[PDB]
């Protein structure tokens, strides 16, 4: 597709077949095709940030006027539990454990599309490692093609967005949104330059 810099030029590995291709691999990590197929998966799973960054941002701005009285994202350690914290990790771990390995196989051989315990029923019908249709897409949207590039691009910004959140928190000692609104206190003086 496009190019991140007009000169220098895209590498041969960056054909454009992949959604979100812009010829940006100055270092050269993804040069071995096996290397890409793995980093392609990592970019999607990391990218899909989005879920979280929106998860730490939006509830912070829903508690803007006093609609909800929930603690900050960096204060939600306790007691956000009807079962205490240490209960939840194990539950989160054990089962995520299960989902993650199954997801793992599809990267090497697709796969595990079928249901399991189920006595007499269907299985996922799909193709492509990074994106599995099925209830994963109950609406049955369009696995196109551009969105696949939309998906990425939004995930990439979210990533940078996360990196922003955590850093900014440090120094700006408080909320990435207070932050956001401390800047708005007529900026032009409210810059990171301050810190």
């Amino acid at each position: 597709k496009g190019e991140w810099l007009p000169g220098l030029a895209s590498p041969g590995y960056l054909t454009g077949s992949l959604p979100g291709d812009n010829g940006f691999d100055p270092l050269g990590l993804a040069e071995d095709p096996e290397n890409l197929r793995w980093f392609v998966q990592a970019e999607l799973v990391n990218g899909r940030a989005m879920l979280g960054v929106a998860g730490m941002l939006l509830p912070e701005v829903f508690t803007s006027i006093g609609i909800i009285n929930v603690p900050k994202w960096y204060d939600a350690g306790k007691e956000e539990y009807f079962a205490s914290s240490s209960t939840l990790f194990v539950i989160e771990f054990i089962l995520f454990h299960y989902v993650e390995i199954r997801r793992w196989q599809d990267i090497k051989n697709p796969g595990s599309v079928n249901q399991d315990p189920i006595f007499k029923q269907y299985s996922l019908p799909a193709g492509e490692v990074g994106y599995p249709g099925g209830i994963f897409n109950p609406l049955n949207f369009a696995p196109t093609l551009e969105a696949k590039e939309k998906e990425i691009a939004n995930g990439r910004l979210a990533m940078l967005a996360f990196l922003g959140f955590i850093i900014q928190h440090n120094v700006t000692g408080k909320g990435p949104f207070d932050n956001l609104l401390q800047h708005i206190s007529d900026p032009w003086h409210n810059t990171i330059v301050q810190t």
Binding site: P26, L27, G28, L29, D32, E34, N35, W38
Partner: protein
């Protein structure tokens, strides 16, 4: 860890006072307003400062009155070895990975030794930053980080 922290230390505290008095003894012969004066006083504030900082960051200090580092891995004292250690290996690998990447690029064609004594090839095309992500050499390991000529 029979050591009691540099804060509640009487020896390490005494050692601070001993050092600055000796420095103060020296400025008495130069007359303030003079050069050797600040240099001595600038040395004194640095002395007070380093003693002040060591007590802040923890540092246990033995009976001798000097800080002893703990490298057991204790979370309370990670900054004494692990965190600087992680920083070292990062730079240590980075150098290792950049150097290896160079000799590899040189080998095909040319006179390879020409590039070794003279490197009018700087970072080759752009090899240095490649080290920013050296740890991804773990993925080079699963493929061909090693040659199969001798043993496995």
């Amino acid at each position: 860890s029979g050591l009691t922290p540099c804060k509640e230390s009487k020896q390490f505290a005494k050692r601070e006072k001993q050092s600055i008095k000796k420095l103060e003894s020296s400025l008495k012969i130069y007359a303030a307003d003079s050069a050797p004066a600040l240099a001595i006083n600038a040395t004194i504030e640095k002395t007070k400062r380093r003693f002040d900082n060591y007590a802040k960051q923890g540092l246990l200090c033995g009976a001798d009155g000097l800080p002893h580092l703990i490298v057991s891995g204790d979370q309370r004292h990670w900054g004494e070895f692990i965190t600087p250690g992680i920083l070292f290996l990062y730079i240590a690998g980075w150098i290792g990975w950049v150097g290896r990447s160079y000799l590899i690029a040189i080998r095909d064609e040319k006179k390879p030794t020409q590039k070794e004594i003279i490197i009018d090839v700087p970072l080759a095309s752009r090899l240095v930053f490649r080290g920013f992500s050296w740890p991804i050499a773990a993925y080079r390991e699963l493929l061909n980080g090693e040659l199969v000529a001798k043993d496995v």
